[PDB]
Amino acid sequence: NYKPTPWTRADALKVHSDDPTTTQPLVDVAFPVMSEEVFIWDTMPLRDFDGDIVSVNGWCVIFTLTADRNTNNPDFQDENGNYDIKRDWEDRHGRARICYWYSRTGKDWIFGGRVMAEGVSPTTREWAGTPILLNDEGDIDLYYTCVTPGATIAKVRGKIVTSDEGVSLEGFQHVKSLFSADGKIYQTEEQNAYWNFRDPSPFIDKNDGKLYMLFEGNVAGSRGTHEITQEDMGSVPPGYENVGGARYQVGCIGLAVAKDLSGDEWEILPPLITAVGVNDQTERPHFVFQEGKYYLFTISHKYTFADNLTGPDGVYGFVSNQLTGPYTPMNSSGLVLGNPSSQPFQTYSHYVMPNGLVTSFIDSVPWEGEKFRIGGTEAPTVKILLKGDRSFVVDSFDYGYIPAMKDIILK
Ligand SMILES: [Zn+2]
Ligand SMILES: [Zn+2]
Numbered sequence: 188n189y190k191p192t193p194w195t196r197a198d199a200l201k202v203h204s205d206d207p208t209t210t211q212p213l214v215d216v217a218f219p220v221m222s223e224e225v226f227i228w229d230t231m232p233l234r235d236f237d238g239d240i241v242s243v244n245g246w247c248v249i250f251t252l253t254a255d256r257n258t259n260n261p262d263f264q265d266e267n268g269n270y271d272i273k274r275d276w277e278d279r280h281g282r283a284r285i286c287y288w289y290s291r292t293g294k295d296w297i298f299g300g301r302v303m304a305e306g307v308s309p310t311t312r313e314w315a316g317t318p319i320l321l322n323d324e325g326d327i328d329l330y331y332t333c334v335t336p337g338a339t340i341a342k343v344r345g346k347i348v349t350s351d352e353g354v355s356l357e358g359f360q361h362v363k364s365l366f367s368a369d370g371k372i373y374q375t376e377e378q379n380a381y382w383n384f385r386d387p388s389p390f391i392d393k394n395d396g397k398l399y400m401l402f403e404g405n406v407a408g409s410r411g412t413h414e415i416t417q418e419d420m421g422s423v424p425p426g427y428e429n430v431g432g433a434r435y436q437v438g439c440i441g442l443a444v445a446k447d448l449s450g451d452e453w454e455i456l457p458p459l460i461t462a463v464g465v466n467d468q469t470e471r472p473h474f475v476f477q478e479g480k481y482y483l484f485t486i487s488h489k490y491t492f493a494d495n496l497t498g499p500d501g502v503y504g505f506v507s508n509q510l511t512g513p514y515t516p517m518n519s520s521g522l523v524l525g526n527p528s529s530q531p532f533q534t535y536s537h538y539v540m541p542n543g544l545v546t547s548f549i550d551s552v553p554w555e556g557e558k559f560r561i562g563g564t565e566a567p568t569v570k571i572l573l574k575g576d577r578s579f580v581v582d583s584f585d586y587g588y589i590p591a592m593k594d595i596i597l598k
């Protein structure tokens with residue numbers, strides 16, 4: 188049918204940190220925190236099947252990966268008996284639960300609580316995905332990732348109800364497990380104990396009318412066995428032929444197609460982008476559809492790049508005229524919005540919305556000496572412009588500013 192587009196080593200050699208047109212503004216080390224009771228990180232705005240951020244009866248809604256702050260929990264005290272926020276924050280992944288927040292302004296979010304009651308999720312961990320508003324009766328499918336045991340893309344249906352006072356989510360009771368890594372296209376746990384498989388992002392393509400989804404995967408094959416092809420290399424310059432252990436980096440942006448628009452059955456397809464020999468993690472893939480083009484964004488780490496390559500934490504991107512490619516890297520290298528080198532981990536999980544706004548959460552900011560301040564709260568929103576195969580940072584907004592693009596009046 189089609190071939191994946193490689194993000195090549197030659198592309199990655201063009202990545203440039205601290206390009207001000209593609210660098211997030213510096214986070215204030217004295218940033219405010221939205222809650223003294225919970226951490227948040229990955230944030231998923233409520234959207235429809237094309238990408239539009241939608242409010243409901245005037246209420247904006249975000250879903251967050253969420254965990255309790257264990258400030259007064261002795262299990263998270265050091266030997267002196269003092270709260271160890273670093274240990275608490277770094278243990279959040281095993282405590283992740285999906286919660287919702289709402290606001291009529293797109294900021295100053297009001298906490299709504301858990302989407303699912305404890306026990307509904309097949310796995311205790313509730314990792315990231317996408318909440319889709321299905322209709323103007325308020326039905327929502329939360330696509331998300333069930334992790335440990337295994338890694339399984341799943342969805343759960345519920346409903347949103349509004350009042351003059353706020354928003355309530357109800358009925359998220361029945362998780363439907365959709366699919367896991369297959370082993371022929373996408374790498375399995377048996378092939379690699381560290382395999383990546385997560386982060387569903389569904390969309391409908393009006394060109395064929397079908398329901399698809401993006402997700403993070405790895406190219407199938409036993410860990411360490413992947414061959415680096417000339418197509419993975421690209422046109423590298425003289426002297427840049429040593430790839431080191433690059434065969435261990437095998438990230439890809441996966442694709443699947445639903446049998447019909449209910450999205451209850453899926454067919455796994457070849458990936459759209461592969462990064463063999465370049466980067467192990469193409470996370471949280473998501474589309475912006477603009478001017479008939481397919482803008483494909485993904486989030487990655489400085490330290491998941493292969494040997495003798497590097498880049499900043501942040502969002503990378505690719506653009507094509509067709510869903511299945513060929514894709515060309517944004518800003519020539521792929522980098523769309525990277526962290527500044529003086530605060531390289533200030534934010535993560537950078538999500539580009541079709542209005543150009545990019546949200547992220549604050550992770551770790553340098554503080555004093557070799558100390559760091561931990562966030563667990565929303566970062567200032569950045570605005571970028573997409574022009575052809577290039578992007579430009581053009582504005583900055585308040586912490587966690589995630590407004591809607593359209594408002595849906597419920598029937
Ligand atoms: Zn729309
Ligand atoms: Zn309706």
Ligand SMILES: [Zn+2]
Nearest residue numbers: 488489490500
């Ligand atoms: Zn990182």
